[model samples]
Target: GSHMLSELMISLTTALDMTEGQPPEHCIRCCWIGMHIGMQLELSEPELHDLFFTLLLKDAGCSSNAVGTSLSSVINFIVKNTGSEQSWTERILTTIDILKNGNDYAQELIQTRCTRGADVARELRFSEAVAQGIHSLDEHWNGQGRPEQRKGEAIPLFSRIALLAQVFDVFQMEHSIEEALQEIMARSGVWFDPKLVEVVEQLVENPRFLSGLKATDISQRVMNLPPAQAHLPLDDAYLECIVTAFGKIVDAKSPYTAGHSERVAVYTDLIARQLAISDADRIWLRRAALLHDIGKLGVSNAILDKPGKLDEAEWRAVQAHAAYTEQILYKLSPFKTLARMAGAHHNGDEISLMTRIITTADIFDALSAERPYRAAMPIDKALAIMEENLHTAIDPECFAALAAALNLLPDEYT
Candidate 1:
């Protein structure tokens, strides 16, 4: 309540600043997805602000700020947070202790309170109800989850709805609507509330809903908080700053992947405009692009930055990044939908243009960037590589655009 809104604005502004190129319209559209979903679900403005703030700050917990750390540290951080032996209190205390001993103590402190980091969130001036909601962020619907095992309704209805809405966005971010829906249907109760899941399914199929979403009004919604919330409204500038800082954390996981999301983001936005993808879906796609690599935060850098080919097991660990990104991000309220989109890519499904675009873009950028032990490849080669893997991996339309974007088909495409 207290400062969550301002904090969110700050974070968003930070993300905007961190953005590499002029992606103004897309950024506004992305913010609308957060706002519209919150409004449709009736989240109190404070709750909505808190949810978005959490999403923006969620990645602050990363540890690899270097160029060549093995993927081990990434996995260790997730393991420490997800599968620790200590009690909740003990684990939180341990996190604090770790922060106290670190060189970037201040940054670590910020990371500790991020998103699902309950103990850290409690320190902020949130209302009792809001604080309770944040605290139970990682808990599952079956009541066997973390922080507190509060089951069903006790888990806070807003939290549940927010969780579902976030998950819904993921489809647009990671895969096509068809594939995303399949994943959503599959996880209705386990990862989402059945009723909300139904609502999303119905919405996805409603052509009117899909069509009308295009006129959903981006600028108006970008700054609109839920309603009756008690947090400060953050300035756009500050929002960019915070989000950019957060994006850097997600990008630093492997030596070969820094700024990959940013690059993919540019391509996705360009493609969305060229293809006339729906505004709502575009919003989902952009956030998904920003977060698609988040799971890399959980892998060992040794495997991630390895110069030589990865062994079978190492490749499997590398493959887990998208899933892990889905796992952790799906638990938070703002990112649940986007996580679903990211996770679908890992499931070997690419039914949506959004999913295929981001995956292809991510691969394209990953190849373009120079690694610790290797130099970068030409954009043309990257596009050719994607073309070679079309249908079996990427959609044909996406690859065509990838080719078009690189000017590979000068006379043919234009």
Candidate 2:
């Protein structure tokens, strides 16, 4: 069965937002804000369709940026800066600190992310307008923006609108309505389109503007709005392609875990076959395994590559990645089963054979891979450590199947 592409984008955006330290529905709310603004401007139906995906996917390249060449420093800084002891206020301060220093690094980060996002959109056969909007998302009205720094109307119209809406939601979430509007007004004719600011000023005249924006039922409200006719359904082929792409995004967050998800997926399928898993079930299981570490995207690279032991809070942060994976995947109906299976791999009291198989494969790959702090353990030692959980943390049959599968490899399951 096919699913609405918007739903899939929303799910992905939710996960992406969390990785950036925002709430799960951050992109959803931004889309709602942008969609209303698009309607206000009397955008053509086609433009609205492009706007929809643009708002949801504007920050899709963030993970790549966070895990850039200095991936080690980025992760370590994030962990230390945003750790448990660093209260919410400190988190805000840390964000401001980064932005204050946001010159070459920030610009380069935006350029890399936007370019990758646009490329992915085109690869997925999205409209040119959508791709262009993503490409120019970081451009300012003045000549100070990054990458190309397109000025004035040089920026794509949809990108301009999306950028304005994006900042509005972000600032509003950070502070109050008055403060957000003030920030917009402060940058008007510089960072934003003056005409759009005028439009927003009028739109906010309705006393319910801020209240409406903050309404708890924002998702339902967005649903109630008229949808554009131009849309794509998440058919099997497209869904698989998109998820595989995002799996790469997740893995790209750390050099040590590069290709980790794909490897886990391969092992998951092999073990599933050994256990006589149905073909249909195996399909989703493999997909889930490919996505099991998606939550790791939200984790700091420092923690992920920490050579030494983690303290209580850091350990908690490490464990919470599985929950993030499930939260993001649960947004799609078809992926809910996969999400549960993927999410259950960490610290669950009871788990299915499918969960056990994924968990086992996941640990195996981690043990097999050389990390920053340690060399890859031999397969024999890895299995010995895992043998401690053969019946509890992992299914006994699944463990046997994994051993059998690994034995067939050139390494002889050593």
Candidate 3:
């Protein structure tokens, strides 16, 4: 036992919240709220474990459609979140334009989010119960929710709790805890299970119940609650599997980025070996390469997969990804020790040999891969063009390492 599942999910939650317009601690807040409801319902240790993850990863597929149309909740998300740098007027009107043909888009939105969310949970080796909870997160008690309308008791216990938890976090964030509970009470038997609503309303009556949820220590609060078995430390191989799953999550955000993160890891490791880096150091380098672009999940595909140059605000989101990358990775225990490697990936001149090597590999793969705006460059041509930057952009030593690594590659890649 090595890396705790609760710890890893908490780390990823920081990253996942970015994909939506959510506040930084939104996911953990949801877990805190949801677990309270679950415990009040007297859920078993096994069921609580599933409910815990169901609440945390409810939006794992949020990046699939960063922009939504038609749904009242979808439109309200844009209209209500006034802090975005983008003009709220254009966004609400944008949704209204698509709200012209509303029903189909709303269905598709919940379908992709639920299905992709469940699939990612499965990819992480979670049980079908976990997957089903995520899969049915949007379904309503009145058979009005999307993807599918399971209605009432047909919905998974975890799903019912997760949805209510999500609503509690949002309404409480947007208004006061009093108003948030009122909103949930209003939606009871419509958007939520009646019994769960009854339980939560009673649960929040204690002094500081809501205040404790908002404390800065909420991440720790959620982290400490999972069953003892869930706290077992996992081995390095387990970290590898978790990293690989998130790598796929980043790449899956846009079609143009297919296999992009994985190949970057390949190139980074090849360069690492050529540079005679230590075996232990190479492990750090490899994981960093896979995670380098994880922050891109927050960026809209309209920006990422665009065939034209990015506008000012669009490019701003792109540049901010490295900061997001570092914020997410720094939350994990083993990777908490990774220092600044994730943040440094963008600027080779700034930090570690590992950061420099990953940066070099990042540029090489990006140049050699296809994008909506350009064709893939030939390997020989790509390096030659990059070599001109030399000491300024690309680290001189790391560049030479990549060039030498290419010599050992098969014809297909080289």
Against the true structure, whose TM-score is highest? Answer: 2
lDDT of 1: 0.50
On a 0 to 1 TM-score scale, where does candidate 2 land against the true structure?
0.77
Model 3 C-alpha lDDT per residue in residues 316-368, reported as the tens digit of each score: 33433334344433443254334444555542222356566776776677557
Task: Compose the digit string of candidate 1's lDDT tens values, residues 319-373.
Answer: 3333433442232113234555667547223224445566556656655654555
Candidate 1 backbone overlaps, count: 42
Query: Candidate 2: deviation at residue 46, Å?
Result: 1.2
Q: Which portions of model 1 show Cα errors greater than 4 Å?
A: 1-71, 74-124, 144-150, 205-220, 228-414
lDDT of 2 at 79: 47
The alpha-carbon deviation from the true structure for residue 394 of candidate 1, after best TM-score superposition, in angstroms, is 43
**Total backbone collisions for each predicted model:** 42, 3, 5
TM-score of each: 0.39, 0.77, 0.75
Error of 1 at 16 (Å): 9.1
Q: Kindly report which residue pairs in candidate 2 clash with one another.
A: 75-301, 75-302, 380-414
lDDT of 2 by residue, 325-388 (tens): 4443344435444544677555122224556677667666655664556666688776765575
